[PDB]
Amino acid sequence: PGPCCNDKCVCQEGGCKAGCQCTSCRCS
Ligand SMILES: [Cd+2]
Ligand SMILES: [Cd+2]
Ligand SMILES: [Cd+2]
């Protein structure tokens, strides 16, 4: 159970989660 973009920038759609550490999706 990790974050969302640990191995999947899921912002392009809606796969992210309440743990966006990645830096390639302007989540909020
Ligand atoms: Cd991302
Ligand atoms: Cd994310
Ligand atoms: Cd995101």
Contact 9, 22 (CB under 8 A): yes
Q: Which amino acid is at 26?
A: R
Q: How was this structure determined?
A: NMR
- The per-residue b/e assignment along 1-28, b for 16 or more CB within 10 angstroms, e otherwise, is eeebbeeebbbeeeebeeebebeeeeee
> What is the C-alpha separation between 26 and 1, in angstroms, rounded?
22
- Per the listing, tokens 């392009």 go with 12
> What is the C-alpha separation between 25 and 22, in angstroms, rounded?
7
Structure token digits, residue 7: 């191995």
Ligand with minimal distance to 20 CA: 2
Contact 1, 19 (CB under 8 A): no
Which distant-in-sequence residues (6+ apart) come within 8 Å of 23 by Cβ? none
**1: CA distance to ligand 1 center in Å?**
17
Q: CB within 5 A of ion ligand 2: which residues?
A: 4-5, 16, 20, 22
Q: CB within 5 A of ion ligand 3: which residues?
A: 11, 16, 20, 25, 27
The answer to whether the annotation marks 11 as part of a ligand binding site is no
Which distant-in-sequence residues (6+ apart) come within 8 Å of 22 by Cβ? 3, 4, 5, 9, 11
Contact 10, 2 (CB under 8 A): no
